[PDB]
Amino acid sequence: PQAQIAKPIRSG
Amino acid sequence: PAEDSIKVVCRFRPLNDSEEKAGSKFVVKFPNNVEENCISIAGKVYLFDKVFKPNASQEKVYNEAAKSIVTDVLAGYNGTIFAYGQTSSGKTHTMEGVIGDSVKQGIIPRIVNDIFNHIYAMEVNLEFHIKVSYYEIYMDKIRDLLDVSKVNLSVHEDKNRVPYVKGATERFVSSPEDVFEVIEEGKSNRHIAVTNMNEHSSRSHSVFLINVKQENLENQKKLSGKLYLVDLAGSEKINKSLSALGNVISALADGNKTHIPYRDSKLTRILQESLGGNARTTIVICCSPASFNESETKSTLDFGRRAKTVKNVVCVNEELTAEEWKRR
Amino acid sequence: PAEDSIKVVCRFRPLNDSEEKAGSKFVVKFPNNVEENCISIAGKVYLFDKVFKPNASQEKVYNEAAKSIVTDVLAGYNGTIFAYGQTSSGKTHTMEGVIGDSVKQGIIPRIVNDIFNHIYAMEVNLEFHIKVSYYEIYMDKIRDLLDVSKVNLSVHEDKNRVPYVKGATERFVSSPEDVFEVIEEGKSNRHIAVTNMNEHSSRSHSVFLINVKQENLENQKKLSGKLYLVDLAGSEKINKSLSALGNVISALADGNKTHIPYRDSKLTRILQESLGGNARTTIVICCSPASFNESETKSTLDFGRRAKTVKNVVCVNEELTAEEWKRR
Numbered sequence A: 001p002q003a004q005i006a007k008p009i010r011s012g
Numbered sequence B, C: 001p002a003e004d005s006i007k008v009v010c011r012f013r014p015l016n017d018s019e020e021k022a023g024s025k026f027v028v029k030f031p032n033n034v035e036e037n038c039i040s041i042a043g044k045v046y047l048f049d050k051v052f053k054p055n056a057s058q059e060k061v062y063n064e065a066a067k068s069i070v071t072d073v074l075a076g077y078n079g080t081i082f083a084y085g086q087t088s089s090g091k092t093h094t095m096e097g098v099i100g101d102s103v104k105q106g107i108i109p110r111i112v113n114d115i116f117n118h119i120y121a122m123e124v125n126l127e128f129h130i131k132v133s134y135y136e137i138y139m140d141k142i143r144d145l146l147d148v149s150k151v152n153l154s155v156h157e158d159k160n161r162v163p164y165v166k167g168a169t170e171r172f173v174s175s176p177e178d179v180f181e182v183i184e185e186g187k188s189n190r191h192i193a194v195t196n197m198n199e200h201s202s203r204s205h206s207v208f209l210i211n212v213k214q215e216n217l218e219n220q221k222k223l224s225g226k227l228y229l230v231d232l233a234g235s236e237k238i239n240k241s242l243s244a245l246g247n248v249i250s251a252l253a254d255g256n257k258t259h260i261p262y263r264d265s266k267l268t269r270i271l272q273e274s275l276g277g278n279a280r281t282t283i284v285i286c287c288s289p290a291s292f293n294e295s296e297t298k299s300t301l302d303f304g305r306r307a308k309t310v311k312n313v314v315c316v317n318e319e320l321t322a323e324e325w326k327r328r
């Protein structure tokens, strides 16, 4: 069990 | 309506040197004027969603077998493509091809580039969360290709509900470069404890999963879609998971049994949604045109013809935030 | 209870060459045996949450002024640190220092490294979404430092409700390296159309925002916390936004007016929560010890003494998924 960092990517 | 035939597409590769050396003839025909949807062998015609000849490029195969799937996943559908056929028929060439070669790159890298090209070209104010898993199934055991200490993983089923491989790495990615790094890491790990990849890859199933969630920032609509991309063990005689895959297709195809044997293998448990459930599925059956392999080719074609009668029932996977549930 | 004093910490730097050259004396004292919380100037003692002497290292300042803030943001509190004082007193040295130098790196880079060290050392199965904005305020106008076409941005207030700079870039980051790239990009963009950074930075406010959301994957608890890290224009005579900042503090400190003039500047609108609202706020007042600057030092100290009486009311920023709202 580990903390993860997400990597979202935008548009707009 | 939401009722969706499993698509089946058939790909013949060219006769190769070991085939010619052994004195094989080309034993297959492609009727013209019927949308390139037919192939005939020993007098018997089969109809598929598309038939590709030995000269068909990777780009052509992608544009017909696969492209629609990225648009679908980006709209919140689950998508699955798998390649099926005897060892040496073209499954890896179809699913992966030569990564980095513009002409010979297969379905996976094209899908990867297309996902990100589509996102970059959207105007809608959207936020995408993308994570990938990559694992192998060998003798009904699962090895995580992204984490060497995770061997013998289990298949579980979540809340609402849907199977998953518990413990499998899930790597966040945010560009095509990040994905291809993950693929390289997987391929390299696959070699641990394997003395001959050509033989070992011919007998195990390689599973690439891209999970794509999105949040619409204007209306809070949340959509998700899973993309399974699978290069299967060879279908020749008869991998226990492939027997299970055939029994599953046979049961759904007969449609006249209460019990579909999904639990007969980890592969068919993982693909359960792909086989008669909530995903848009395409099977690429890969075939040699050589007389020497004719009986194996005919089993492959007969597998694909049966699968093409299975119906999936698909819907957009929409999640509700609070505002819907809040206000009630 | 949830009632939280604005912390005020006072930092004196060493007498410098222009000060000595001009014949300045060291005019400030630090009483011992009182937890390092006091400073005296011309006979008058002030009490702060911490006083740092000219020899105090960056690590010491961080460990006292700032560290707790990363633990708080990671627990779902908003956090704000700003530096205040006359030009040349030490605000940039305090807030940024020399990035990449192990000894002289300031509060921002230490905070950045600590956020990621804490996340990496958590066991709880947590997912963090981190995005950063970096912008400048000059003459009450906002320039986005991460996107040169976004000048003259507006301040808006969202649903539930909370201000924000509309249109400001929000860059996702997933390692300390990604953050420092963003900081370098910001610093470099700041130089566009500026002929003298030393003078221009002394007259504008630099705002660094780290937005940290987390989802707990076991219980679906969603927490968020915003970290504002601000290096203000010089306080000397008298930047219009700094007048507004003083009128705000003066009003909250008197506590006896219905109208806190938050809307008097974009700075005080953006900091509205930091000044009497839902954030844990620390102000570093920076001061020269030189007789030459004594009257400016005394205004700085008097500003900090007034701010230290303002009370913030803070709570964990928890969001509910469906299961709470669903079941009702």
Ligand SMILES: Nc1ncnc2c1ncn2[C@@H]1O[C@H](COP(=O)(O)OP(=O)(O)O)[C@@H](O)[C@H]1O
Binding pocket: B012, B013, B014, B016, B054, B085, B086, B087, B088, B089, B090, B091, B092, B093, B094, B202, B286
């Ligand atoms: N359509 C095709 N055109 C040219 N060469 C192909 C084609 N399909 C397969 N090959 C080649 O034939 C060999 C066997 O294909 P491969 O995809 O490795 O088979 P499988 O993975 O099904 O065992 C590989 O060298 C591959 O490059």
Ligand SMILES: Nc1ncnc2c1ncn2[C@@H]1O[C@H](COP(=O)(O)OP(=O)(O)O)[C@@H](O)[C@H]1O
Binding pocket: C012, C013, C014, C016, C054, C085, C086, C087, C088, C089, C090, C091, C092, C093, C094, C202, C286
């Ligand atoms: N505590 C300190 N120790 C040593 N040098 C300092 C200290 N504080 C400030 N300085 C130096 O004094 C000069 C002015 O500080 P700076 O942080 O640029 O002031 P401001 O940003 O408030 O105008 C800079 O060269 C900085 O390196």
Ligand SMILES: [Mg+2]
Binding pocket: B091, B092, B093, B201, B202, B231
């Ligand atoms: Mg292969």
Ligand SMILES: [Mg+2]
Binding pocket: C091, C092, C093, C201, C202, C231
């Ligand atoms: Mg400065």
